[PDB]
């Protein structure tokens, strides 16, 4: 993780600084996200739980849901019927059902973003992209949290423009190899 958060790092802290909201910073380890990277917000006000070193289910983790979405549709299936106990309803918005993760997963793999919709805590949303490898295959992920109140204010689309080209920035940094680096 040093290497990845030697390059991310400055990407990552430039984006903390001009949204002012808490940005994340995960590695894919097989059925969980693992949260490397995390800054606090700024002038943001909503400050979540997570911390560095948090294994993050894949089922209701925006970030967890990109790995899905890029990996292959078996490994879905497989982890639904070996993650029974582990998927639960955490909100009435949290995605339990196999069909309905597929419909999602489809949309991510297609449009190359995700949302954690309150699917963890009511108020609290996420929007989350793929930070690419030389191949295409999706080892690290960005996000950043932040009020459902402030998201609806500001806007999905306009706050993933920044976050897809600091995910961009850092793919790219990446494919051809701050404080906090």
């Given amino acids: 993780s040093l ?10 802290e430039a984006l903390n600084i001009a949204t002012g909201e808490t940005i994340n ?25 997570a911390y560095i070193g948090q294994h993050m289910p894949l089922y209701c983790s925006a970030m967890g849901k990109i790995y899905m979405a890029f990996g292959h549709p078996d490994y879905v299936k497989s982890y639904w019927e070996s993650h029974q106990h582990e998927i639960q309803p955490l ?30 805590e009511l108020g609290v949303s996420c929007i989350a992209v793929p930070v690419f490898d030389i191949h ?9 949290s932040l009020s459902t109140s402030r998201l609806k204010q500001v806007g999905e689309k306009n706050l993933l423009k ?7 920035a850092i793919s790219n940094e990446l494919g051809f190899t701050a404080i906090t680096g």
Avoid at 27 to 48: C, Q
């Fill in 3 to 12: 290497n990845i958060i030697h390059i991310a790092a400055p990407h990552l």
């Fill in 25 to 49: 910073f995960s590695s894919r380890e097989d059925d969980h996200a693992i949260l490397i990277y995390k800054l606090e917000p700024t002038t943001g006000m909503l400050r979540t739980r």
């Fill in 91 to 120: 909100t009435r918005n949290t995605i339990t059902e196999l069909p309905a993760m597929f419909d999602e997963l489809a949309h991510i793999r297609e449009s190359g973003a995700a949302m954690d919709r309150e699917e963890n």
């Fill in 136 to 144: 295409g295959r999706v080892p690290y992920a960005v996000s950043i």
């Fill in 162 to 168: 920044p976050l897809r080209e600091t995910a961009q």
